[PDB]
Design a protein around this ligand. Structure first.
Ligand SMILES: Nc1ncnc2c1ncn2[C@@H]1O[C@H](COP(=O)(O)OP(=O)(O)O)[C@@H](O)[C@H]1O
Ligand SMILES: [Ca+2]
Ligand SMILES: [Ca+2]
Length: 313
């Protein structure tokens, strides 16, 4: 944990030496760790409870040193695997590090989601109050952490958090041509009015034009065992009949029933065996399935997909 003197020195550099005057209250004992910082709770001068996310001063050096080590270690392998896009992975980690070290980018992403979900009946996104490279101040989100609901939730709380996460994942692309790109339970909470609180916009996925109708079509045709129209749809949108059925199961099986019971045993079943356009999106969809499985959530996936997934209806 970054000690109080150092926390204050970051805020001095980022917000000015009179930063403490912008608050009514600021608690020096952080309430949570972040990837490369820690989160404090305070109260803004206007009485709003706030989250203050503060980057560790040594984070940039530590992440950069690690990128240089990865670059040296992979250079070794490029002479063995000259086909492997190893330089592309290191370039991607470099770009993701630059993004994470500038909390203005997460704050911009959060403002876009806050506007898209303004007055949403199902989703609460905290307003950004202040943003700087190493400090983000947003509205405190009060609710039960998804991690608590996974461990000790009522069935109703579990089902609601899976249903909300499903609606966020399927719906965000039609609403603002992006996905929330990190389905980890630390990013979510259950508000007492039934909304799901959504935080951490460091990792959004752009999806301009939204999901391609080909995604919904592909699940609709696979459910319908319409293999004559499916394989041609699946080749065009980028083969045993068993193998397709197998790779589509975690997507098809839940929309064959009005209400699917996601669970860890079923996940481990669908697993076990024997195009960057959508690549990240399909990863976030699988991440949402996995979280629904840890929640043990009963989810009406069929109606949500019918309403929000192009070509499924
Ligand atoms: N607005 C907020 N309200 C309440 N808790 C928050 C808020 N922002 C962050 N937190 C807490 O701090 C943790 C870390 O913040 P997060 O934005 O997820 O950091 P990271 O950069 O690691 O993704 C969250 O998992 C949550 O426990
Ligand atoms: Ca997070
Ligand atoms: Ca993050």
């Amino acid at each position: 944990p970054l000690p109080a003197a150092k926390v204050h020195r970051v805020l001095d550099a980022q917000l000015g030496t009179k930063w403490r005057d912008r608050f009514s209250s600021f608690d020096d004992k952080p309430v949570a760790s972040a990837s490369i910082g820690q989160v404090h709770k305070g109260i803004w001068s206007d009485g709003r409870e706030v989250a203050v996310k503060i980057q560790y001063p040594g984070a940039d050096e530590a992440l950069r040193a690690d990128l240089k080590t990865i670059q040296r270690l992979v250079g070794v392998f490029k002479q063995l695997a000259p086909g492997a896009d190893i330089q592309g992975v290191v370039d991607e980690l470099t770009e993701r590090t630059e993004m994470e070290l500038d909390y203005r980018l997460e704050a911009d992403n959060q403002r876009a989601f806050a506007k898209a979900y303004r007055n949403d009946p199902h989703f609460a996104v905290p307003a950004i109050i202040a943003s700087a490279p190493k400090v983000v101040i947003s509205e405190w989100m009060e609710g039960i952490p998804m991690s608590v609901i996974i461990r000790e939730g009522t069935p109703e709380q579990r089902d609601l958090m899976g249903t909300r996460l499903t609606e966020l994942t399927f719906g965000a692309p039609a609403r603002l041509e992006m996905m929330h790109g990190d389905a980890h339970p630390g990013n979510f909470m259950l508000l007492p009015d039934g909304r799901m609180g959504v935080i951490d916009f460091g990792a959004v996925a752009p999806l301009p034009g939204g999901f391609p109708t080909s995604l919904g079509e592909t699940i609709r045709l696979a459910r319908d065992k319409n293999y004559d129209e499916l394989l041609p749809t699946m080749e065009r949108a980028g083969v045993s009949i068993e193998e397709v059925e197998d790779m589509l199961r975690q997507y098809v099986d839940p929309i064959k029933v009005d209400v699917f019971h996601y669970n860890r045993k079923w996940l481990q079943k669908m697993a076990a065996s024997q195009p960057a356009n959508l690549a990240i999106p399909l990863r976030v969809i699988a991440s949402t399935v996995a979280i629904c499985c840890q929640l043990d959530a009963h989810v009406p996936v069929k109606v949500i997909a019918t309403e929000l997934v192009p070509g499924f209806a």
